[PDB]
Subunit: 264 residues, 3 copies
Amino acid sequence: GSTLRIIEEPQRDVYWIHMHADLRACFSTRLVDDITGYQTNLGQRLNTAGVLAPHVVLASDSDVFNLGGDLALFCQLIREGDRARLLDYAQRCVRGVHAFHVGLGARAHSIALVQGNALGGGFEAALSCHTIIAEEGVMMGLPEVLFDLFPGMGAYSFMCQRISAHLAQKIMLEGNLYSAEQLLGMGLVDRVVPRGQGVAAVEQVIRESKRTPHAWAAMQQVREMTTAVPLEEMMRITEIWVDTAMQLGEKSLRTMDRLVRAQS
Amino acid sequence: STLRIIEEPQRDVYWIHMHADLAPGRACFSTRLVDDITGYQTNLGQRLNTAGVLAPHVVLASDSDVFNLGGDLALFCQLIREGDRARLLDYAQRCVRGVHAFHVGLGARAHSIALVQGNALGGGFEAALSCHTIIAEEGVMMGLPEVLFDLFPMGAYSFMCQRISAHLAQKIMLEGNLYSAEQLLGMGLVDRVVPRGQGVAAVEQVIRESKRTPHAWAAMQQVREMTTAVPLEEMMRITEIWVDTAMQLGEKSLRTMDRLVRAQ
Amino acid sequence: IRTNISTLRIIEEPQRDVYWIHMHADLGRACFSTRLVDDITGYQTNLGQRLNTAGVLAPHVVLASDSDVFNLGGDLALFCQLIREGDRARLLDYAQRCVRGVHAFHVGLGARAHSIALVQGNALGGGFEAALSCHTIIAEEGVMMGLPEVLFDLFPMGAYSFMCQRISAHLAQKIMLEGNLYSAEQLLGMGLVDRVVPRGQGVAAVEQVIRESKRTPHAWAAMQQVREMTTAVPLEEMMRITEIWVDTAMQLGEKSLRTMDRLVRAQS
């Protein structure tokens, strides 16, 4: 769990997950394992304690939110032809984001606090939460498509919850980066605040939300039988993602190599 | 006794005016009102089918200074304090049958039109959303403020998702805000907004337009049935969720509901 | 099993896997005549087969028009003839053929192709639906689109299915029933079209979409696979809707039929 800085507030049942406590700021296998590990642990305690409508905040201790998938790993596994290991990584990432999407199995309120740039998997992670709070500037998008890498952490599924299937498709293929304000007008982020005011915004959401715990839980039950993204669906999409990733040529791999270096 | 019905078999237009019995009490969905509405719906629907009338029109309106204040809070408090889940569930199921009937045109592929000339809160707002066309007069306020005392909203979510994103629908349902007709129009939650006292004229305009394309309307309804229509069974599973949550309302929520009844 | 595919003017660029289909090369009114529909479906199958065999990744197919309008929709003259003769069989056959044509664009000819509709003239009824079936719609200023046929009680195919991909089910219904015509600008703000450009700049706009899109072939193919298992409109669904369409069409009254008669003459 060295990759995470955890702050737990049992009294009010608010829990903070800070990524990149070990520090590129990406979803390394260690970070993914640490996140899923904590999600499972926290979810178990919440269930066992019978807590109603807990809040879980996803944040970052880095100057960026999260740069997405572990491109260095992708290049290694693709060049080695290790589909099995790549698929496993993808599935673990999906379990992570889906957990936020369904409230860790504890009907929790997941809040993404984006105070830096969120690219690829990073943007997907934010979209997996119930509420997205971003500061100015910040920059969010899936530019990885520009070297022909299909987004692999539920971008389409999560976006369709907020926008049309067609627009979601356009955004995913275009490879553009959007400002927090642009995303707000697009309905992809919920609140935009000045720099350094992110945490304050999160507290506002919590305070307002904590006044309707049963209503929240009920809403979550309804989502579960209606609009919720099925984990089984996301897994079938990971098969598509891995198959496409494994077909990346050296041009793409080399570009990914250069990106890692520039960011690292 | 709770309804003032005006039938025009000449042009197959049927007006349902709620709250005819008050002409003194609370303008809400009392058990009697719900029974009266569902009873008439079933009767009219069967009559229309037997007569084979194509694309009839049914208008939901109110004779009170408000459209409808929603669920019978006075009843809820009684049943909740008595622990009578059976009766509460039965009430909920009857309400769902009523709103779903409007949604599917009474089983006669009719055109449901909600004429909202007064405030529509909770169930009242949901009733309007269950119709195919919502006509509101300037100044009118609609919303689901009951969530503020932790009472989950019926078919609100189901109906809203027909007009807006699942994400936005969820946010609206949990915020507990009231919206003006003007705002609702820009949000896509109401279809037409006209000056006070012009509501009926607006309804007649919709009727005239629609009556000029009966076969096309019937076809559209057939398509809806095999695509986007909200399943009755789905709404009936949601009632289970609703009752389970309602039965857990604390004393403070009950007192708040008590006061609201008195005030209204 | 290849076979012969003059209602179309085809321009193929295998050098870059781009293929242009220009409707109304034979030009009566610029609508979906039985001849045009057969020409389109025939070419779609031929090209699709070639693309599949070649294993080409993310080919582009452009639907355009050589007429001053994009497409006026269904063959009203044919409808009136069949309806008055009570020939449901032939009417249904026509509808199903149209559905196969539009669905093919929707699913990229079964070769994961990127379908682009270049609308430089009015697109009515089937014409508007045809554009909505594509993945990208590029329109020029001044162009009007809509489904005014509903006005004489003719139900719009897959218009509803295709619109629900871009807008709410509720708004789709209203647009489907109102019978209004919308400008390219209006459609853009509504999310029903993707880009609006000045007159005569349509082709340039298409080239721009293609040039940029060609940088992400594998990504496109993957997206199409996801669409297939999630939000793509099933051919089965459209076929069931054709039954509803024909049953309604066969019930058109004298007034409607006469209105259709005059429309054909006016447009012709």
